[PDB]
């Protein structure tokens, strides 16, 4: 029974890591949105500068 409990705990921890992956993907998405905005703002300034 002790060994079986250990197996269950290990399975749960692995599942937690797999979820953390998705969390990091969401963080990537927010950073990408920020970059896209900062890029859009700059392309409005070049024609004025010319």
């Amino acid at each position: 029974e002790k060994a079986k409990t250990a197996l269950a705990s290990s399975v749960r921890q692995t599942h937690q890591l797999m979820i953390n992956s998705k969390q990091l993907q969401a963080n990537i998405e927010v950073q990408k949105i920020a970059l896209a905005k900062a890029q859009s703002d700059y392309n409005r300034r070049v024609p004025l500068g010319n």
Binding site: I19, Q23, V30, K37, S40
Partner: protein, 50 residues
Amino acid sequence: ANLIGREELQHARDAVTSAQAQLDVAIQQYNANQAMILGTKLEDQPAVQQ
């Protein structure tokens, strides 16, 4: 109706998308740490049985 600048609307849409990304991050943070508490009852949790 062509009243406000386009960069104001762009910044509104970007804000909405960023907020959605942040909510996704929060939901994922919750989904992890719910893998540990899968078992409904406190007495049945793997740690206690050990």
